[PDB]
Fold Translocator protein.
Amino acid sequence: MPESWVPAVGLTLVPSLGGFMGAYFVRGEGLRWYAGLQKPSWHPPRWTLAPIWGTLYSAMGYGSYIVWKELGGFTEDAMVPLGLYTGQLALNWAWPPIFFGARQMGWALADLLLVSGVATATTLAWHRVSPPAARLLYPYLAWLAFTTVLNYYVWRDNSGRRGGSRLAE
Ligand SMILES: CC[C@@H](C)N(C)C(=O)c1cc2ccccc2c(-c2ccccc2Cl)n1
């Protein structure tokens, strides 16, 4: 039944819901909390990147199609890659603690799950089965890349107070 593939759309929508909740914190009252925290001046509007999921959303769907092209459809072979993404992503969903509160600066946890979670699961499955699909992710690298640098600016500003010895002259 065609319904078997339909979940592919759901596969990409699922992760979007998780990241949204984390972004919702800084987006809302967190803004007040951020007043204490310093955000890089080159930081773009919150409503701008927040929509990124829309960008990754479509890519994840079409990317899976590429995998379907090689396998010829959904077969035990196809279940391993796409299935892993749904499963591995869920296990990772359990990692973030800030989702419940986020009141604490621990927001950094969103960064690790965000980047490694979405990339680690997709990379092992799609890359091996469909290397070309990895290119489709292209924007994923840029989006995740911003969080790495963006996170240091906020955390370093506060965390900078401690671990100063970590840096050399
Ligand atoms: C803090 C500014 C955020 C909203 N920004 C401009 C982003 O591009 C962004 C988008 C996201 C989308 C999904 C999940 C997370 C983010 C995070 C982010 C990065 C590190 C820690 C916490 C968050 Cl919400 N940051």
Summary: The longest helix spans residues 108-129. The chain has eight helices and no strands. Helices lie at 7-27, 30-34, 46-49, 52-71, 76-93, 108-129, 131-137, 139-159.
